[PDB]
From TrEMBL, chain C:
Belongs to the 4-oxalocrotonate tautomerase family. The chain holds residues 67 to 127 of 128 of the full protein. It comes from the Bacteria. Residues 8-56 form the 4-oxalocrotonate tautomerase-like domain. It comes from Burkholderia lata (strain ATCC 17760 / DSM 23089 / LMG 22485 / NCIMB 9086 / R18194 / 383). This is 4-oxalocrotonate tautomerase.
Automatic annotation (TrEMBL), chain D:
Residues 1-58 form the 4-oxalocrotonate tautomerase-like domain. This is 4-oxalocrotonate tautomerase. GO terms for molecular function: isomerase activity. Belongs to the 4-oxalocrotonate tautomerase family. Coiled coil: none annotated. Keywords: Isomerase.
Length: 58, 63, 62, 61, 58, 61
Protein backbone atom coordinates (compact mmCIF):
# COMPACT_ATOMS: atom_id res chain seq x y z
CA UNK A 1 0.00 0.00 0.00
CA UNK A 2 1.16 3.53 -0.91
CA UNK A 3 -0.35 6.50 0.97
CA UNK A 4 0.15 9.98 -0.45
CA UNK A 5 -0.71 12.45 2.33
CA UNK A 6 -1.26 16.10 1.43
CA UNK A 7 -0.89 18.20 4.56
CA UNK A 8 -0.02 21.80 5.41
CA UNK A 9 3.48 22.95 6.19
CA UNK A 10 4.25 23.63 9.83
CA UNK A 11 4.65 20.20 11.47
CA UNK A 12 8.00 19.31 12.94
CA UNK A 13 9.95 16.21 12.00
CA UNK A 14 8.92 14.37 15.15
CA UNK A 15 5.26 14.92 14.26
CA UNK A 16 5.78 13.69 10.70
CA UNK A 17 7.52 10.58 12.04
CA UNK A 18 4.59 9.93 14.39
CA UNK A 19 2.11 10.37 11.55
CA UNK A 20 4.02 7.93 9.33
CA UNK A 21 4.18 5.37 12.15
CA UNK A 22 0.50 5.69 13.04
CA UNK A 23 -0.87 5.76 9.49
CA UNK A 24 1.22 2.64 8.82
CA UNK A 25 -0.24 0.94 11.89
CA UNK A 26 -3.75 2.02 10.86
CA UNK A 27 -3.17 0.41 7.47
CA UNK A 28 -1.85 -2.88 8.85
CA UNK A 29 -4.74 -3.11 11.35
CA UNK A 30 -7.53 -2.29 8.92
CA UNK A 31 -6.63 -4.31 5.80
CA UNK A 32 -3.96 -6.72 7.08
CA UNK A 33 -1.15 -5.55 4.80
CA UNK A 34 2.34 -6.64 5.88
CA UNK A 35 3.99 -3.64 7.49
CA UNK A 36 6.98 -3.77 5.13
CA UNK A 37 4.72 -3.17 2.10
CA UNK A 38 3.25 0.07 3.51
CA UNK A 39 4.81 3.24 2.11
CA UNK A 40 3.81 6.74 3.24
CA UNK A 41 4.60 9.83 1.11
CA UNK A 42 3.94 13.10 2.94
CA UNK A 43 3.38 15.96 0.46
CA UNK A 44 3.77 19.20 2.40
CA UNK A 45 2.03 22.23 0.89
CA UNK A 46 2.36 25.91 1.83
CA UNK A 47 -0.89 27.52 2.90
CA UNK A 48 -0.92 29.48 -0.38
CA UNK A 49 -1.16 26.13 -2.24
CA UNK A 50 -4.16 24.75 -0.34
CA UNK A 51 -7.63 25.58 -1.62
CA UNK A 52 -10.65 24.63 0.48
CA UNK A 53 -14.03 25.83 -0.73
CA UNK A 54 -12.46 28.19 -3.25
CA UNK A 55 -10.51 29.96 -0.48
CA UNK A 56 -6.78 29.66 0.00
CA UNK A 57 -5.60 28.53 3.42
CA UNK A 58 -3.50 31.73 3.34
CA UNK B 1 -6.84 18.81 5.14
CA UNK B 2 -5.36 16.29 5.19
CA UNK B 3 -6.16 14.62 1.87
CA UNK B 4 -4.96 11.01 1.66
CA UNK B 5 -4.69 9.09 -1.60
CA UNK B 6 -4.41 5.39 -0.74
CA UNK B 7 -3.17 3.18 -3.58
CA UNK B 8 -4.12 -0.48 -3.03
CA UNK B 9 -3.84 -3.60 -5.11
CA UNK B 10 -7.39 -4.48 -6.15
CA UNK B 11 -9.19 -7.19 -4.20
CA UNK B 12 -10.04 -5.71 -0.79
CA UNK B 13 -13.61 -6.00 0.49
CA UNK B 14 -15.90 -2.99 0.85
CA UNK B 15 -15.82 -3.48 4.63
CA UNK B 16 -12.02 -3.43 4.56
CA UNK B 17 -12.12 -0.15 2.63
CA UNK B 18 -14.53 1.37 5.20
CA UNK B 19 -12.16 0.31 7.98
CA UNK B 20 -9.15 1.76 6.19
CA UNK B 21 -10.95 5.05 5.49
CA UNK B 22 -12.10 5.36 9.10
CA UNK B 23 -8.68 4.45 10.51
CA UNK B 24 -6.65 6.79 8.30
CA UNK B 25 -9.04 9.71 8.80
CA UNK B 26 -9.20 9.36 12.59
CA UNK B 27 -5.44 8.79 12.85
CA UNK B 28 -4.65 11.81 10.67
CA UNK B 29 -7.10 14.06 12.53
CA UNK B 30 -5.72 13.17 15.96
CA UNK B 31 -2.00 13.42 15.08
CA UNK B 32 -2.37 16.67 13.11
CA UNK B 33 -4.92 18.37 15.40
CA UNK B 34 -7.34 18.83 12.49
CA UNK B 35 -11.13 18.43 12.47
CA UNK B 36 -12.23 14.95 11.46
CA UNK B 37 -14.95 16.28 9.16
CA UNK B 38 -12.37 18.01 6.94
CA UNK B 39 -10.33 14.87 6.21
CA UNK B 40 -10.54 13.24 2.81
CA UNK B 41 -9.40 9.78 1.81
CA UNK B 42 -9.45 8.54 -1.78
CA UNK B 43 -8.70 4.88 -2.45
CA UNK B 44 -7.28 3.98 -5.86
CA UNK B 45 -7.72 0.26 -6.60
CA UNK B 46 -4.99 -0.87 -9.00
CA UNK B 47 -5.14 -4.32 -10.65
CA UNK B 48 -2.17 -6.60 -10.07
CA UNK B 49 -1.34 -6.25 -13.79
CA UNK B 50 -0.90 -2.48 -13.43
CA UNK B 51 1.45 -2.28 -10.40
CA UNK B 52 5.13 -3.19 -10.44
CA UNK B 53 7.79 -3.60 -7.78
CA UNK B 54 11.36 -3.83 -9.01
CA UNK B 55 10.12 -4.19 -12.58
CA UNK B 56 7.86 -7.14 -11.82
CA UNK B 57 4.08 -6.92 -11.77
CA UNK B 58 2.25 -7.63 -8.54
CA UNK B 59 0.61 -10.52 -10.38
CA UNK B 60 3.98 -12.03 -11.31
CA UNK B 61 4.98 -11.79 -7.64
CA UNK B 62 1.86 -13.73 -6.64
CA UNK B 63 -0.12 -10.63 -5.65
CA UNK C 1 1.98 22.87 -18.56
CA UNK C 2 -0.27 23.00 -16.47
CA UNK C 3 -1.36 19.43 -15.57
CA UNK C 4 -4.49 18.87 -13.48
CA UNK C 5 -5.64 15.60 -11.92
CA UNK C 6 -9.32 15.85 -11.00
CA UNK C 7 -10.44 13.17 -8.54
CA UNK C 8 -14.24 12.77 -8.73
CA UNK C 9 -16.80 10.49 -7.15
CA UNK C 10 -18.11 8.19 -9.86
CA UNK C 11 -21.43 9.21 -11.36
CA UNK C 12 -20.92 12.37 -13.41
CA UNK C 13 -22.12 12.21 -17.01
CA UNK C 14 -19.86 12.23 -20.06
CA UNK C 15 -21.07 15.73 -20.85
CA UNK C 16 -20.34 16.96 -17.33
CA UNK C 17 -16.88 15.45 -17.73
CA UNK C 18 -16.31 17.18 -21.08
CA UNK C 19 -17.55 20.47 -19.63
CA UNK C 20 -15.12 20.07 -16.71
CA UNK C 21 -12.14 19.40 -18.97
CA UNK C 22 -13.06 22.48 -20.99
CA UNK C 23 -13.79 24.79 -18.06
CA UNK C 24 -10.68 23.75 -16.10
CA UNK C 25 -8.42 24.20 -19.13
CA UNK C 26 -9.69 27.65 -20.17
CA UNK C 27 -9.42 28.85 -16.59
CA UNK C 28 -5.88 27.74 -16.01
CA UNK C 29 -4.85 29.20 -19.41
CA UNK C 30 -6.49 32.46 -18.62
CA UNK C 31 -5.15 32.93 -15.08
CA UNK C 32 -1.61 31.77 -15.85
CA UNK C 33 -1.43 33.19 -19.41
CA UNK C 34 -0.42 29.65 -20.34
CA UNK C 35 -1.11 28.47 -23.90
CA UNK C 36 -4.38 26.56 -23.96
CA UNK C 37 -2.95 23.85 -26.23
CA UNK C 38 -0.43 22.74 -23.57
CA UNK C 39 -2.86 22.29 -20.63
CA UNK C 40 -3.58 18.69 -19.54
CA UNK C 41 -6.62 17.58 -17.53
CA UNK C 42 -6.99 14.01 -16.28
CA UNK C 43 -10.15 12.76 -14.57
CA UNK C 44 -9.87 9.92 -12.05
CA UNK C 45 -13.32 8.48 -11.20
CA UNK C 46 -13.59 7.07 -7.65
CA UNK C 47 -16.44 4.67 -6.70
CA UNK C 48 -18.44 5.70 -3.65
CA UNK C 49 -16.92 2.76 -1.71
CA UNK C 50 -13.44 4.23 -2.26
CA UNK C 51 -14.14 7.88 -1.30
CA UNK C 52 -13.94 8.97 2.34
CA UNK C 53 -15.55 12.14 3.68
CA UNK C 54 -14.74 12.81 7.32
CA UNK C 55 -13.92 9.16 8.00
CA UNK C 56 -17.07 7.77 6.39
CA UNK C 57 -17.39 6.39 2.88
CA UNK C 58 -19.51 8.23 0.36
CA UNK C 59 -21.65 5.08 0.07
CA UNK C 60 -22.28 5.12 3.83
CA UNK C 61 -23.46 8.68 3.00
CA UNK C 62 -21.28 10.66 5.39
CA UNK D 1 -13.83 16.88 -5.92
CA UNK D 2 -10.06 17.08 -5.39
CA UNK D 3 -7.84 18.83 -7.95
CA UNK D 4 -4.07 18.42 -7.91
CA UNK D 5 -2.67 21.18 -10.10
CA UNK D 6 0.93 20.79 -11.30
CA UNK D 7 2.39 24.22 -12.10
CA UNK D 8 5.87 25.44 -13.00
CA UNK D 9 7.28 27.87 -10.48
CA UNK D 10 7.18 31.58 -11.27
CA UNK D 11 3.55 32.43 -10.49
CA UNK D 12 2.86 34.67 -7.50
CA UNK D 13 0.50 34.21 -4.54
CA UNK D 14 -2.21 36.39 -6.08
CA UNK D 15 -2.15 34.39 -9.30
CA UNK D 16 -2.29 31.15 -7.32
CA UNK D 17 -5.20 32.43 -5.22
CA UNK D 18 -7.07 33.35 -8.41
CA UNK D 19 -6.40 29.88 -9.79
CA UNK D 20 -7.74 28.18 -6.65
CA UNK D 21 -10.83 30.39 -6.73
CA UNK D 22 -11.47 30.10 -10.46
CA UNK D 23 -10.79 26.36 -10.66
CA UNK D 24 -13.19 25.84 -7.75
CA UNK D 25 -15.88 27.80 -9.58
CA UNK D 26 -15.22 26.05 -12.88
CA UNK D 27 -15.76 22.80 -10.94
CA UNK D 28 -18.99 24.00 -9.30
CA UNK D 29 -20.36 25.15 -12.66
CA UNK D 30 -19.20 22.09 -14.66
CA UNK D 31 -20.28 19.19 -12.43
CA UNK D 32 -22.57 20.85 -9.89
CA UNK D 33 -20.27 20.16 -6.94
CA UNK D 34 -21.16 21.96 -3.67
CA UNK D 35 -18.42 24.53 -3.35
CA UNK D 36 -17.26 23.60 0.15
CA UNK D 37 -16.46 20.12 -1.26
CA UNK D 38 -13.93 21.33 -3.88
CA UNK D 39 -10.30 20.89 -2.78
CA UNK D 40 -7.50 22.39 -4.85
CA UNK D 41 -3.91 21.34 -4.11
CA UNK D 42 -1.21 23.25 -6.00
CA UNK D 43 2.09 21.44 -6.69
CA UNK D 44 4.77 23.89 -7.81
CA UNK D 45 7.60 22.34 -9.84
CA UNK D 46 11.01 23.86 -10.57
CA UNK D 47 12.03 23.93 -14.22
CA UNK D 48 14.52 21.10 -13.57
CA UNK D 49 11.55 18.88 -12.54
CA UNK D 50 9.45 19.35 -15.69
CA UNK D 51 9.92 17.21 -18.79
CA UNK D 52 8.19 17.99 -22.07
CA UNK D 53 8.88 15.49 -24.84
CA UNK D 54 11.87 14.06 -22.99
CA UNK D 55 13.52 17.48 -22.56
CA UNK D 56 13.84 19.41 -19.32
CA UNK D 57 12.06 22.75 -19.06
CA UNK D 58 15.36 23.95 -17.54
CA UNK D 59 17.05 23.44 -20.89
CA UNK D 60 14.23 25.51 -22.42
CA UNK D 61 12.11 22.69 -23.89
CA UNK E 1 11.04 5.81 -6.58
CA UNK E 2 7.25 5.87 -7.03
CA UNK E 3 6.18 6.41 -10.64
CA UNK E 4 2.52 7.07 -11.44
CA UNK E 5 1.96 6.60 -15.17
CA UNK E 6 -1.27 8.06 -16.56
CA UNK E 7 -2.03 6.43 -19.89
CA UNK E 8 -5.12 5.78 -22.02
CA UNK E 9 -7.09 2.65 -21.26
CA UNK E 10 -6.85 -0.35 -23.55
CA UNK E 11 -3.27 -1.63 -23.51
CA UNK E 12 -3.12 -5.37 -23.06
CA UNK E 13 -1.53 -7.04 -20.05
CA UNK E 14 1.59 -7.98 -22.05
CA UNK E 15 2.29 -4.35 -23.01
CA UNK E 16 1.73 -3.29 -19.41
CA UNK E 17 4.28 -5.82 -18.17
CA UNK E 18 6.82 -4.60 -20.75
CA UNK E 19 6.21 -0.97 -19.80
CA UNK E 20 6.61 -1.73 -16.09
CA UNK E 21 9.88 -3.59 -16.66
CA UNK E 22 11.28 -1.02 -19.10
CA UNK E 23 10.39 2.06 -17.04
CA UNK E 24 11.95 0.39 -14.03
CA UNK E 25 15.15 -0.26 -16.00
CA UNK E 26 15.09 3.35 -17.19
CA UNK E 27 14.86 4.58 -13.58
CA UNK E 28 17.77 2.42 -12.45
CA UNK E 29 19.81 3.55 -15.48
CA UNK E 30 19.14 7.23 -14.76
CA UNK E 31 19.43 7.57 -10.99
CA UNK E 32 20.80 4.24 -9.74
CA UNK E 33 18.01 3.51 -7.27
CA UNK E 34 17.92 0.03 -5.71
CA UNK E 35 15.64 -1.71 -8.14
CA UNK E 36 13.40 -3.22 -5.43
CA UNK E 37 12.60 0.35 -4.31
CA UNK E 38 11.21 1.28 -7.75
CA UNK E 39 7.40 1.04 -7.76
CA UNK E 40 5.38 1.69 -10.91
CA UNK E 41 1.65 2.40 -10.76
CA UNK E 42 -0.15 2.40 -14.10
CA UNK E 43 -3.28 4.60 -13.97
CA UNK E 44 -5.44 3.76 -16.99
CA UNK E 45 -7.87 6.46 -18.08
CA UNK E 46 -10.82 6.24 -20.50
CA UNK E 47 -10.59 8.63 -23.43
CA UNK E 48 -13.49 10.67 -22.04
CA UNK E 49 -11.26 11.31 -18.99
CA UNK E 50 -8.27 12.71 -20.89
CA UNK E 51 -8.20 16.42 -21.64
CA UNK E 52 -5.55 17.75 -24.02
CA UNK E 53 -5.77 21.47 -24.66
CA UNK E 54 -9.35 21.74 -23.42
CA UNK E 55 -10.52 18.88 -25.65
CA UNK E 56 -11.35 15.37 -24.53
CA UNK E 57 -9.54 12.47 -26.18
CA UNK E 58 -12.99 11.13 -27.09
CA UNK F 1 0.20 11.08 -23.04
CA UNK F 2 1.62 9.43 -21.09
CA UNK F 3 2.03 11.76 -18.13
CA UNK F 4 4.44 10.34 -15.55
CA UNK F 5 4.60 11.72 -12.01
CA UNK F 6 7.88 10.52 -10.46
CA UNK F 7 8.24 10.89 -6.69
CA UNK F 8 11.85 10.70 -5.47
CA UNK F 9 13.53 11.04 -2.11
CA UNK F 10 15.28 14.42 -2.13
CA UNK F 11 18.98 14.69 -2.92
CA UNK F 12 19.38 13.69 -6.59
CA UNK F 13 21.36 15.97 -8.88
CA UNK F 14 19.85 18.16 -11.57
CA UNK F 15 21.78 15.98 -14.03
CA UNK F 16 20.15 12.82 -12.62
CA UNK F 17 16.72 14.41 -12.93
CA UNK F 18 17.32 15.41 -16.52
CA UNK F 19 18.55 11.90 -17.31
CA UNK F 20 15.43 10.47 -15.67
CA UNK F 21 13.16 12.74 -17.71
CA UNK F 22 14.92 11.67 -20.92
CA UNK F 23 14.88 7.95 -20.09
CA UNK F 24 11.28 7.67 -18.88
CA UNK F 25 10.01 9.69 -21.83
CA UNK F 26 11.91 7.84 -24.56
CA UNK F 27 11.10 4.48 -22.95
CA UNK F 28 7.38 5.23 -22.74
CA UNK F 29 7.37 6.39 -26.35
CA UNK F 30 9.31 3.32 -27.50
CA UNK F 31 7.24 0.71 -25.61
CA UNK F 32 3.85 2.25 -26.43
CA UNK F 33 4.72 3.19 -30.04
CA UNK F 34 3.59 6.73 -29.22
CA UNK F 35 5.05 10.14 -30.14
CA UNK F 36 7.86 11.26 -27.85
CA UNK F 37 6.86 14.93 -28.12
CA UNK F 38 3.54 14.38 -26.31
CA UNK F 39 5.10 12.75 -23.22
CA UNK F 40 5.21 14.61 -19.92
CA UNK F 41 7.24 13.92 -16.81
CA UNK F 42 6.81 15.72 -13.48
CA UNK F 43 9.29 15.09 -10.66
CA UNK F 44 8.38 15.57 -6.99
CA UNK F 45 11.14 15.54 -4.38
CA UNK F 46 10.27 14.41 -0.96
CA UNK F 47 12.57 14.79 2.05
CA UNK F 48 13.76 11.78 3.94
CA UNK F 49 11.82 13.01 6.95
CA UNK F 50 8.61 12.86 4.85
CA UNK F 51 8.93 9.33 3.42
CA UNK F 52 8.12 6.20 5.39
CA UNK F 53 8.61 2.52 4.69
CA UNK F 54 7.26 -0.01 7.15
CA UNK F 55 6.42 2.81 9.57
CA UNK F 56 9.98 4.19 9.76
CA UNK F 57 11.16 7.32 8.02
CA UNK F 58 13.79 7.13 5.30
CA UNK F 59 15.92 9.28 7.63
CA UNK F 60 15.58 6.76 10.44
CA UNK F 61 16.37 4.31 7.55
Amino acid sequence: PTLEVFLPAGHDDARKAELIARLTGATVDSIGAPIESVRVLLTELPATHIGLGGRSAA
Amino acid sequence: MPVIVAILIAGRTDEQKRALIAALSETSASVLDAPLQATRVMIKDIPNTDFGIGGQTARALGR
